[PDB]
Design an enzyme around this catalytic site. Structure first.
Site, short mmCIF file in Angstrom:
data_model
loop_
_atom_site.label_atom_id
_atom_site.label_comp_id
_atom_site.label_asym_id
_atom_site.label_seq_id
_atom_site.Cartn_x
_atom_site.Cartn_y
_atom_site.Cartn_z
N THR D 148 0.80 -1.22 0.00
CA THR D 148 0.00 0.00 0.00
C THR D 148 0.84 1.27 0.00
O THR D 148 0.55 2.17 -0.80
CB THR D 148 -0.97 -0.03 1.19
OG1 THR D 148 -2.02 -0.97 0.93
CG2 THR D 148 -1.58 1.34 1.43
N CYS D 165 6.59 -0.68 7.44
CA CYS D 165 6.83 -0.95 8.85
C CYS D 165 8.25 -0.56 9.24
O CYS D 165 9.19 -0.70 8.45
CB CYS D 165 6.60 -2.42 9.17
SG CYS D 165 7.45 -3.56 8.06
N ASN D 375 7.42 -6.63 14.17
CA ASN D 375 6.85 -5.37 13.74
C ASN D 375 5.40 -5.26 14.21
O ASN D 375 4.91 -6.08 14.99
CB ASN D 375 6.97 -5.21 12.23
CG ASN D 375 6.10 -6.19 11.47
OD1 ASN D 375 6.07 -7.38 11.77
ND2 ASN D 375 5.39 -5.69 10.47
N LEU D 376 4.70 -4.22 13.73
CA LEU D 376 3.32 -4.00 14.12
C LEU D 376 2.39 -5.09 13.61
O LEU D 376 1.34 -5.34 14.21
CB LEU D 376 2.86 -2.63 13.61
CG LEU D 376 1.40 -2.20 13.80
CD1 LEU D 376 1.08 -1.96 15.26
CD2 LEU D 376 1.12 -0.96 12.97
N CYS D 377 2.75 -5.77 12.52
CA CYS D 377 1.98 -6.88 11.99
C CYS D 377 2.59 -8.23 12.34
O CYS D 377 2.07 -9.26 11.89
CB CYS D 377 1.81 -6.75 10.48
SG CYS D 377 1.23 -5.13 9.93
N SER D 378 3.67 -8.25 13.12
CA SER D 378 4.28 -9.48 13.63
C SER D 378 4.66 -10.44 12.50
O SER D 378 4.43 -11.65 12.58
CB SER D 378 3.38 -10.17 14.65
OG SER D 378 2.15 -10.55 14.07
N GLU D 379 5.24 -9.90 11.43
CA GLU D 379 5.79 -10.73 10.37
C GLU D 379 7.22 -10.38 10.00
O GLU D 379 7.87 -11.17 9.31
CB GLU D 379 4.90 -10.66 9.11
CG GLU D 379 5.43 -9.79 7.98
CD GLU D 379 5.14 -8.32 8.19
OE1 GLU D 379 4.31 -7.99 9.06
OE2 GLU D 379 5.73 -7.49 7.46
N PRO D 575 0.06 -8.99 6.32
CA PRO D 575 -1.38 -9.24 6.25
C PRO D 575 -2.03 -8.84 4.93
O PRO D 575 -3.00 -9.49 4.51
CB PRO D 575 -1.94 -8.42 7.42
CG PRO D 575 -0.84 -7.50 7.83
CD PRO D 575 0.43 -8.20 7.51
N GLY D 577 -3.90 -6.08 3.95
CA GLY D 577 -5.29 -5.82 4.30
C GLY D 577 -6.17 -5.31 3.18
O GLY D 577 -7.08 -6.01 2.74
N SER D 578 -5.91 -4.09 2.70
CA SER D 578 -6.82 -3.44 1.76
C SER D 578 -6.38 -3.57 0.31
O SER D 578 -7.23 -3.47 -0.59
CB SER D 578 -6.97 -1.96 2.10
OG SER D 578 -7.97 -1.77 3.09
#
Ligand SMILES: Nc1ncnc2c1ncn2[C@@H]1O[C@H](COP(=O)(O)OP(=O)(O)OP(=O)(O)O)[C@@H](O)[C@H]1O
Ligand SMILES: Nc1ncnc2c1ncn2[C@@H]1O[C@H](COP(=O)(O)OP(=O)(O)OP(=O)(O)O)[C@@H](O)[C@H]1O
Ligand SMILES: Cc1cn([C@H]2C[C@H](O)[C@@H](COP(=O)(O)OP(=O)(O)OP(=O)(O)O)O2)c(=O)[nH]c1=O
Ligand SMILES: [Mg+2]
Ligand SMILES: [Mg+2]
Ligand SMILES: [Mn+2]
Ligand SMILES: [Mn+2]
Ligand SMILES: [Mn+2]
Ligand SMILES: [Mn+2]
Lengths: 683, 289, 289, 683
Positions: D148, D165, D375-379, D575, D577-578
Site C-alpha cells: 500500500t 513498517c 513489527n506492528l503486523c508481527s511478520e 497481512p 489488508g486493503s
C-alpha cells in the site's frame, strides 16, 4: 506523640487569652535535645567528617580541594561561632527534613545548619577562604538564602542541578516539539521546573506540508509535555512540574484554557502541566472598548510575514493581521475571554497572567528579544530566542533558552544588620558563581543562554514579616515607601556589583551594547526621581545605611557606560516556598496567608506561627485574604519598578468575591504596571 | 412552604467522594485489630446496601407518586445522591483500605446476612406496595423511608463516628459526616411529606397509621438489635450502639410528627465528638482607575 | 465497558442555573423584532415542554427497567439534571425575558400546537408502552429517548445557537449550550444501552428493530419539517434549520449504532460558531503433541 | 442509492436458492459507466496529462525525466493493451477510493488503474523502458502487488514513505527513550507503522544512579509512546499505530499486559499502541514442567554481565540469572502467565506472540544479532542492534533499526501464468529499488539498517483463493503440499535473484560473511530434502514450471557462496489488508474470514464475495472460524519453513472455545515452528 510536637501544639492552647508563642521556642529545644542531637552523626574532628562525606560520595572532591584543610576548618569555625539557634520548631524541622544531609539509609543526620552553610559558602567562594567566611557570615546571619536547589545541592555529589527554573522556546515543527519534550524530560530529571512557550506552535486545523486541517494544535503538544513531565519526576521523588505559556491572540487560547476546566475530558485536560497566558496591551484595549477581538492562526501569519506571531509587536501588527486576507483568524469576545480567565483562576488558580507590554516597556534587552513568556512560578522575565532544531545529521540553530539563578535576601535580617549593599553584592557574586558552574549537556539553548546572558535572579523575602515586626501595615503607604526605597537600593547595588564584575572580568553579557543599560535609558527614572523615603518612620528604619541619591545613580550610570554590566538580568522575586521556613521568614514579598498555619506531617499535627508574631504585632500580621488586593497590587508594582524581571504575585481572594472582582484586580495590576500574576488562591 | 428551601439546601450540599483524598487513613487503618477492620467493612457494606435500594427504588418511586415539579426535583436530587454519591463513596473507601478479595467477600457477606436481607425485604416491600393515587400506601412507604434515613443507617454510622471522634480514620470519617448531613435533611423532608398525608385523615385512620408506624418501628428495631450484636460483640460495643440507635429512632419518630418512644440515655461522648464561583460581567467602568 | 467512564463525564459536567447571570440579555432582547421574539419564545417553550417529559418519565422509566446498579446511578444522575438543573434553567430564561402573563400565553399556545403535541405524544407513548422484563419494549423506548436527546431538541436549539453565534442573547445562549452538552451525552449513553439490547437479538429480530427505528425516524422527521416551517418561515431560516435537523438525525442514528440516513450537508456557520472467554486452566499434556 | 450499489446488493437476493454472484460484475460496469468514467479527468493525449500532473505537484518530475516521452507513452500503451477489467465492484471501489490519485479537492479522478500501474512501473524501472514494460505486465496481470505505501505513493510529489513498517530498538536511557519517541513521531508522520522493543528498558522499581525504586518501568515509556503515536497520526487521516514488544522474562511483563486489560485504569491503560510478547523456549519449557519461573530486572542483569537481558540466550543464561544474587528477580507462575496471555488475546486480540527460539533457530543472521522483537503486523523478524543515543554535543552510536519494503505475490495469478520465477525476480528487483530510493533523514538507525541490511519483504496473497478455486481444501494435506512446493520455489528464486543482484553490483549486505547463507548452512534442508509435490494434483498444478530439485538448490548454494546475497532478508508475508481487494485476492496466506463480507460505506452497505466464489467452490471457501486452528498452524508452519522472516498469523477463534483452547493453539504453533502469532480474532 513526641515531646517537641506536644510543646508545639501547646501554642494554640490559650493562657490568659493569649497564644503561647514562646512555647514554640521550648519545642525547638526539645526537637534538638530529644531528636536532632541523638540522630546527628558526630566525628572526632572535622577532618574525619570531611573524609567520610567525600569517600562515601556525599560531597564533591573538587570544591573542597580548592582549600587547605585549615581554611575549611576556619570557615566551619566561623559558621559555628555565631551559635545560631532556630527560633521556631518549624524552621529546624524543615531544614533537617528537607535540606540537612542524611545517610543513604535516611536515619542519621550528617549535616547541621552550620555544616550545610559552611559547605555552601566553600562552594560559593571557589577557593577564597576570606570570601567563604564572608558567605558563612552572610548565611549564618540569615541575610541571604540561596534557593532550594543551590542550598540543598551545593557541594553534594549526589545532586541535581543548582538551577530549577528553565524557560524553553518551542519552534513550529515536529523536530522542535520532540526536542522540547526531550529537553523538558532532561531538565525535570535534573530537578528543575520547565516552562515552555507554545505561541510559535501553529493552532489546531492548520496545514502541514500544504494538507489542510492537519495540525492538532497546542493541546496535543500540551498532552505530550504533560506525559513527559509525569514520566520525569525526579526519580520518583517529587511530582514533575511543568508550565506552558500561550499568547492570548493564539487561536488555541480557548482550548489551551479548556485544558484546566474540570468538565474537560481525559483527552483534553492536562493535570501536571501548569498553564500561563500572555496578554498584550492590545487585548486589554480591545476588551476595554468592547470591540470584538481576533485570535490568529500562527502559521498563516508566519507564511505571510516570515516571522512568528509572538515575535512581533501585536499593538502595531493587530490591524494588519485583521486586514490581511491571507492571515486566518477567528472572531472572539475579549471580555468573554477575560471572564473565562477569571472563572478558571477562581476554580483552579490557572492560568498565570503575563502582561506582555508591562514587561517589555521596562525590559532592558528588547534588542535581543522581547519577553514572550514567563517561568513555572511566573517571575522570570527574560529575552529568549527560539532554536531551529533540524533533522538528524544536520546542524541545529541554537537559540537562547532562559535559565536564571535564584537567591533571596531576608529583608528583616538584611535591614537590621544595615547591610543592604554587602548582602546584595555577596548574593550577586554567589549567583554569578552558581551560573558559571552550571553546565547542562542536554539543553543546548539553556546552556548557550546561561553562558551568554549570565542572568541571575536575586529575590527578597520576609517583607511582610519585617513590616509587621516594625509596626507597619502591609497595605499602608509607609510599607510601599519602604519597599520602594529598599528595592531601589537593592537594584542600585545589584547594578553596581554587575558592573564591577564586568570590569573585573573584562566582559559583559552578550549583546549588552544594545541594552538600555549601555544606552543609559534604564537609569533615566533613577537620575531624575529621588527614591529616598517620604516618611520619617521609613527614614529612621534606613538609618545607618547610605541611601543612593540621584547623583549616586548618575555615577552608577556612568560606571555602567564605561565598564558595562556582567548580568543581563539580576533581580527576580521567587515564591521561596520552603526556604522561608528555615530562614524563619514570610514567603517572598507576599503578605502572609495565615498568622498561624496548621500542618499535618505523618500522623502528627504541627503549628507554625508567622515569624515574630506576638500580641503586640498580631494586628500588623494581617492575613493576605483579609487585605485589599488593590493595595497589594500597589505594593507589588512599587517593588516591580525596581525589579528588572517579574515578581511571583499570587492573588489572595475570598470565596465571596466573584469573577468580576478577579478581573478588576487583574486589570488594576495591568494598569499599575504589574508584569505577572501568579495564582488566585481562594480562601 | 418548605420545598424551595430544601431544594436550595440539597443543591448547595452537593459533593463527590473524590473531593476527599483517602490515602491519609492508610496508617490508622493498618493499626486496627482484625476484629475492628472486619466490623468496619461490614458496617459500611450494610450502609452501601441501604443506599443502593434508597437510590434505585425508594427515592425514585416516592418521586413518581408525589405531585408537583419542585417536590419531584428535590426527591430526584436526593435519589441521585443515594446511588451516584453515597453508595459509590463506600467503594472509594473500600478500594483505598482493602484488597480486592476482602472487598469481594464483604459484598458476598451482605447477600447472605439474614438481618440485612430482612431489613431490605421489609423496606423495599413497602416501596413496591405503593399504589397510584393511593395516599395510604404512599404514607406507609414514606414512614419506611424515614426509618431508613433517620434510624436504620445509624447502627452503621456509629463506628466511623466513633473512630473520627478519637482522631482515627478521619478522611473516611469526613465522607461519612457528609453522608450523614445529607440523610438528616432527607429524613426531615420525607417526614414532612408523610405528615401532609397523615394530617388529611380522620382521627380513626390516624390512630391506625400510628399503630402501623410504631409496629413497623418495633419490628425493625428488634431486627436491628440482632444485627448490632452480630457486628459489634467482637469489638465490645453492642450496648453503646444500641443506645445510639434508640436515640435516632426517637429522631425518626419526631421527623414523622410523633412523640419519642424510647427513654433518653447517655451516648458515648466520643461519638458526640465524631459529629465554580459566582460570575459577573465586566462593566466598562472596571477598565478605568 | 462504558458506564464508569460516562459516570465520570456526567458528574464533572455538573452545573447550576445561578452560575450564569441572565439580566444582561435584556440589552439585546429589546433590539429584536416581534417575529424574532415570538419565534424565540415558542422554541423555548417547545424545549421546556419536551424536557419536562424527559425528566418526569423518560429518564426515570429507563432507570427503572435497566438492570445494573452503576447504570441506575448514571441514569438517576441524568434524571436529576433534567428536573433540578435544566427545568430551572428554562424557567429562569423565561422569567428574565417575558412578563408572567406573556409566559402563560406562550405555554398555552405551544401546549395546543399540533406539531409540538404530535412529537411529544409519540415519544411519551413509547415510554408508556414499556413492559416489565420485556427488553424489546425497553429498546423501543430507548430509541425514542435517543431521538429526543440527539435529534428532536435540535430544531429548537438552532435559534439560541444562531443568536449566540451572532453575539445576541449570550447569557441564555451559554445556558442553552450547557443544556445541549448534557443532552448530547444523555443521547450517547442511552444509545449504548439500546445497542446492548439490539446485539442480544437474532438477525431477523435485528432487521425488525432497524425497520422500527427508521420508520419512527421518518414519522418524527416529517413532523419536524412541518414544525420547522411553522416557527422559522417568519424569520426566513427554515432551509438552514432543515439541514441542522438532518445532521442531528444522523448523529442520533450513529448513537444507536446505525448508518446515517441523510446525505452529509454543511451547517450554517453562525450556528457552528454558537456550537470474556471462559477461563479454563491448562491441564498439562497440552504441552505435548 | 447508486445503481451499482443496488446491483451489488442484488447478490444476496437469492434466485432459485443461489446467490447472484454475476450481478457483482454488472455492478462494476455500472460503477464505471456512471461514476468512474464521469469522474475521471481526460486529456487530449498522455503529454498533457503528464504535464498537468507534474506542474500541479502531483508527480515527481525526477523519475519521469529518466524516460523520453516516447518510452512513457509505450509503457502506458502496454498497460492499457491488457484491457484490464475489475471482476468485482469492491476491487474497483477500493482502488478508486484508497489508491487512485485524485485532485486537491478530491472531486475528480486523475489516475486510472493502468495509469497508477504505469507510474509505479516507471518508478521501479529507474530509466529502463523494457524493465518498465516488464513491471507493467507483472502488475496489470496482477501477478505482483506492491505494498500500500509503495503502490499508493510511488512517483507522487505529495507522497509519504514507501516503507510500511519500522522497528526500533530502545536502549535503557532517558536520552534513548526521548530519541525513540522522536523517531516514532517522525516515522508515523511518514505514515509507517512503528514497532519498539522495550525489553532493554529497566523494569519498575529500578535504580537511576544509585537512588532505588525510581524507574517507572516500561509502562511509563508505553504511555509516552502512546501519546506520541496519538499526536503523530498521519496529519489526522489514519490513526497513529504503534507496537510495543516486551520479552516475557521482563519483570514488567504483567504490567505490560495490564495495559491491554479492559478494566485497566487510565494511568495504565494504553489504547493506540499494540503490544507484543516475545517468548523464548525457556518460558514454554518452564510452563510445560509447571516449575515456577522468574522474571528479571534488566538493569541488574546489565550491571552484572555488561549485556542486556534480551541480548543473550535465556535458554542458557536463565539458571545463571536465577542463581546470581546480584541479579534481581520476581517469582511468577509461567502457566498463569500463559493463561493471562490467552485471556488477553480472547478479550482484545493482544498481545502479539513471538516465539523467539522458533525465529532464531532458522535465523540466517544471528551473527549480526538475534531477532528480539517483531513489527506492528508481527511478520518482520530481522536482526537489530540497539543504538546509543548520547547527550547533546556527543556523538551517538548508531545501531540497526529494522525496516523492510513489502510486496505480495498473487498466488492465483502467478501460478495461472506459470511465472513463479519471473514474478519473484521482478518483485525482488522492485523491492530492491524501493529500498535503494528510501532515505529517512530523521531515523538514523533505520537509514543505516536500510543501507546495510538491504532487507526486503516479498509476501504472498490469494493462497486460499487459489486453493478454493482449484478444488483444494485449505486444511487438506494437498494444500500444505502446494504451499510447501510454491514457497520453496519462491525462496529459491528470491535467493537466486538476491545472489544475481549481489553479483551484478559486486556488493552483498553488511556482515553477510558470518551469515548462514555464506557458510552454506541455510541450504542444508534444501540440499538433502526434496520439496516437489507429493500429490499428483499439486504436481499437475505445477506443470509447465521447473520445480527446483536438490541439484538446483546445490547449484544455487554454490552460486551464493561464489557471489553472496544482496539482501539480508527477502521474504515476509504481511497481512495485505486493503490492497488484496484491488487484486481480487484473499488476504495474505490466511484463510478467508467470511465467504461474503458486508461492509458499510457512507450510508450504503456493500457485499464483497470472495474472489471466485460460486456454487461449485462454496464449500472449498471454508470460513477461517469454522476451520481447525491446528491445521491452519500446520499450513503456516509449512509456509514458514521457506520464509526467512515471519508470517502475520491471525488466529480465528469461536466464542464457544475457552482460553485453554487458545493456549493449546499457541503451544502447538510453538511446537510446529511458528515464529509469530498476529491476532486472536473471535467470531
Ligand atoms: N533552638 C536551637 N536551635 C539550634 N540548635 C539548638 C537549639 N537548641 C539546642 N540546640 C542544639 O543543642 C545544643 C544544646 O544547647 P543548650 O540549649 O542545651 O545549651 P548550650 O549552652 O547552647 O549548649 P552547648 O554546650 O551544646 O553549646 C546546642 O549546642 C545546639 O547544638
Ligand atoms: N470492470 C471494469 N473494469 C475496468 N474498467 C471498466 C470496467 N467496466 C467498464 N470499464 C471502463 O468503462 C468503459 C466502458 O466500456 P465497456 O467496458 O462497456 O465496453 P466497450 O464500450 O465495448 O469498450 P471496451 O470494453 O473495449 O473498453 C471501458 O472501456 C473501460 O474503460
Ligand atoms: C530520568 C528517568 C529515567 N527513568 C528510567 C528510564 C530509563 O530506561 C532508565 C535509565 O535512565 P538514564 O537516562 O540512563 O539515567 P542515568 O544515565 O542518569 O542513570 P544510570 O547511570 O543508572 O543509567 O531510567 C525513569 O523511569 N524516569 C525518569 O524520570
Ligand atoms: Mg516546518
Ligand atoms: Mg544510563
Ligand atoms: Mn444516602
Ligand atoms: Mn437519604
Ligand atoms: Mn434536559
Ligand atoms: Mn436529557
Amino acid at each position: 506523640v513526641p515531646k517537641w510536637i506536644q510543646l508545639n501544639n501547646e501554642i494554640m492552647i490559650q493562657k490568659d487569652g493569649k497564644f503561647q508563642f514562646d512555647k514554640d521556642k521550648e519545642a525547638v529545644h526539645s526537637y534538638f535535645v530529644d531528636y536532632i542531637n541523638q540522630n546527628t552523626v558526630f566525628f572526632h574532628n572535622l577532618k574525619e567528617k570531611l573524609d567520610y562525606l567525600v569517600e562515601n560520595q556525599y560531597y564533591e572532591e573538587e570544591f573542597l580541594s580548592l582549600y587547605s584543610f585549615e581554611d575549611i576548618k576556619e570557615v566551619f569555625k566561623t559558621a559555628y561561632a555565631k551559635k545560631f539557634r532556630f527560633p521556631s520548631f518549624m524552621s529546624a524541622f524543615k531544614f533537617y527534613n528537607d535540606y540537612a544531609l542524611k545517610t543513604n539509609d535516611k536515619k542519621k543526620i550528617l549535616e547541621r545548619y552550620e555544616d550545610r552553610i559552611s559547605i555552601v559558602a566553600l562552594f560559593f567562594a571557589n577557593g577564597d577562604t576570606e570570601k567563604a567566611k564572608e558567605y558563612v557570615n552572610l548565611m549564618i546571619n540569615q541575610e541571604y538564602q540561596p534557593s532550594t536547589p543551590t542550598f540543598l545541592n551545593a557541594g553534594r555529589k549526589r545532586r541535581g542541578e543548582l538551577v530549577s527554573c528553565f524557560l524553553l522556546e518551542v519552534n513550529d515543527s515536529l523536530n522542535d516539539i520532540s526536542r522540547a519534550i526531550d529537553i523538558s524530560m532532561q531538565l525535570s530529571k535534573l530537578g528543575g521546573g520547565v516552562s515552555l512557550n507554545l505561541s510559535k506552535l501553529r493552532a489546531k486545523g492548520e496545514a502541514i506540508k500544504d494538507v489542510e486541517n492537519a495540525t492538532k494544535g497546542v493541546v496535543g503538544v500540551m498532552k505530550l509535555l504533560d506525559n513527559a513531565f509525569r514520566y520525569a519526576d525526579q526519580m520518583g521523588q517529587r511530582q514533575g512540574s511543568g508550565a506552558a505559556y500561550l499568547n492570548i491572540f493564539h487561536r488555541d487560547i480557548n482550548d489551551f484554557l479548556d485544558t484546566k476546566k474540570i468538565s474537560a475530558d481525559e483527552d483534553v485536560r492536562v493535570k501536571t502541566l501548569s498553564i500561563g497566558v500572555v496578554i498584550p496591551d492590545k487585548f486589554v484595549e480591545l476588551a476595554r472598548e468592547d470591540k470584538a477581538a481576533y485570535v490568529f492562526y500562527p502559521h498563516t501569519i508566519y507564511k505571510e510575514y516570515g516571522q512568528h506571531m509572538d515575535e512581533m509587536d501585536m499593538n502595531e501588527m493587530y490591524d494588519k493581521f485583521v486586514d490581511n486576507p491571507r492571515v486566518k483568524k477567528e472572531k472572539i469576545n475579549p471580555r468573554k475571554l477575560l471572564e473565562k480567565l477569571a472563572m478558571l483562576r477562581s476554580e483552579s488558580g490557572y492560568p498565570y497572567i503575563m502582561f506582555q507590554d508591562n514587561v517589555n516597556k521596562v525590559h532592558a534587552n528588547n534588542h535581543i528579544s522581547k519577553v514572550k513568556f514567563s517561568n513555572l512560578c511566573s517571575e522570570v522575565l527574560q529575552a529568549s530566542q527560539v532554536s531551529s532544531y533540524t533533522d538528524y545529521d544536520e546542524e541545529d540553530e541554537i537559540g537562547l533558552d532562559i535559565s536564571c539563578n535564584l537567591g533571596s535576601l531576608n529583608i528583616l535580617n538584611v535591614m537590621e544588620h544595615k547591610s543592604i549593599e554587602k548582602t546584595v553584592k555577596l548574593a550577586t557574586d554567589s549567583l554569578t558563581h552558581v551560573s558559571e558552574t552550571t553546565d547542562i549537556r542536554n539543553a543546548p539553548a539553556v546552556r548557550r543562554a546561561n553562558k551568554a546572558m549570565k542572568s541571575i535572579g536575586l529575590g527578597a523575602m520576609n517583607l511582610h514579616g519585617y513590616l509587621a515586626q516594625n509596626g507597619i501595615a502591609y497595605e499602608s503607604p509607609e510599607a510601599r515607601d519602604f519597599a520602594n526605597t529598599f528595592f531601589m537600593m537593592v537594584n542600585f547595588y545589584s547594578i553596581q556589583r554587575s558592573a564591577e564584575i564586568a570590569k573585573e572580568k573584562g566582559e559583559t553579557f552578550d549583546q549588552y551594547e544594545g541594552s538600555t543599560y549601555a544606552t543609559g535609558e534604564y537609569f533615566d527614572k533613577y537620575v531624575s526621581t529621588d527614591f529616598s523615603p517620604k516618611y520619617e518612620k521609613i527614614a529612621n528604619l534606613f538609618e545607618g545605611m547610605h541611601i543612593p541619591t540621584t547623583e549616586d545613580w548618575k555615577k552608577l550610570k556612568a560606571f555602567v557606560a564605561e565598564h558595562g554590566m556582567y548580568h543581563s538580568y539580576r533581580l527576580c522575586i521567587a515564591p521561596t516556598g520552603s526556604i522561608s521556613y528555615v530562614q524563619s521568614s514570610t514567603a517572598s514579598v507576599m503578605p502572609i496567608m495565615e498568622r498561624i498555619e496548621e500542618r499535618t506531617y505523618g500522623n502528627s499535627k504541627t503549628y507554625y506561627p508567622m515569624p515574630g508574631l506576638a500580641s503586640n504585632n498580631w494586628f500588623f500580621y494581617k492575613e493576605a485574604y483579609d487585605m485589599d488586593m488593590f493595595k497589594v497590587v500597589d505594593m507589588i508594582a512599587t517593588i516591580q519598578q525596581h525589579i528588572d524581571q517579574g515578581i511571583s504575585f499570587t492573588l489572595f481572594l475570598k470565596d465571596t468575591m466573584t469573577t468580576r472582582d478577579l478581573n478588576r484586580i487583574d486589570l488594576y495590576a495591568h494598569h499599575r504596571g504589574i508584569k505577572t500574576i501568579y495564582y488566585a488562591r481562594t480562601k | 412552604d418548605f420545598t424551595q428551601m430544601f431544594y436550595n439546601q440539597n443543591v448547595k450540599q452537593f459533593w463527590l467522594p473524590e473531593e476527599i483524598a483517602l490515602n491519609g487513613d492508610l496508617l490508622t487503618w493498618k493499626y486496627l485489630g482484625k476484629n475492628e477492620q472486619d466490623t468496619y467493612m461490614k458496617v459500611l457494606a450494610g450502609l452501601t446496601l441501604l443506599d443502593t435500594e434508597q437510590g434505585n427504588t425508594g427515592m425514585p418511586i416516592v418521586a413518581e407518586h408525589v405531585d408537583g415539579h419542585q417536590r419531584k426535583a428535590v426527591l430526584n436530587f436526593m435519589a441521585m445522591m443515594e446511588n451516584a454519591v453515597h453508595a459509590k463513596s463506600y467503594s472509594n473507601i473500600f478500594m483505598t483500605l482493602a484488597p480486592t478479595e476482602t472487598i469481594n467477600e464483604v459484598f458476598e457477606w451482605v447477600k447472605q446476612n439474614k438481618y440485612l436481607q430482612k431489613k431490605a425485604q421489609m423496606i423495599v416491600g413497602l416501596y413496591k406496595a405503593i399504589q397510584k393515587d393511593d395516599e395510604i400506601s404512599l404514607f406507609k412507604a414514606m414512614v419506611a423511608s424515614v426509618y431508613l434515613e433517620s434510624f436504620l443507617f445509624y447502627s452503621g454510622f456509629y463506628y466511623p463516628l466513633y473512630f473520627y471522634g478519637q482522631g482515627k480514620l478521619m478522611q473516611s470519617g469526613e465522607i461519612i459526616n457528609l453522608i450523614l448531613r445529607d440523610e438528616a435533611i432527607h429524613g426531615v423532608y420525607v417526614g414532612l411529606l408523610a405528615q401532609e398525608i397523615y394530617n388529611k385523615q380522620t382521627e380513626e385512620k390516624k390512630a391506625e397509621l400510628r399503630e402501623f408506624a410504631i409496629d413497623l418501628l418495633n419490628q425493625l428495631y428488634e431486627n436491628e438489635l440482632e444485627y448490632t450484636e452480630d457486628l459489634y460483640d467482637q469489638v465490645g460495643l453492642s450496648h453503646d450502639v444500641k443506645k445510639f440507635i434508640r436515640y435516632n429512632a426517637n429522631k425518626a419518630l419526631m421527623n414523622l410528627g410523633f412523640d419519642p418512644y424510647f427513654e433518653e440515655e447517655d451516648i458515648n461522648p466520643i461519638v458526640l465528638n465524631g459529629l465554580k464561583a459566582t460570575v459577573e460581567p465586566l462593566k466598562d467602568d472596571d477598565f478605568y482607575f
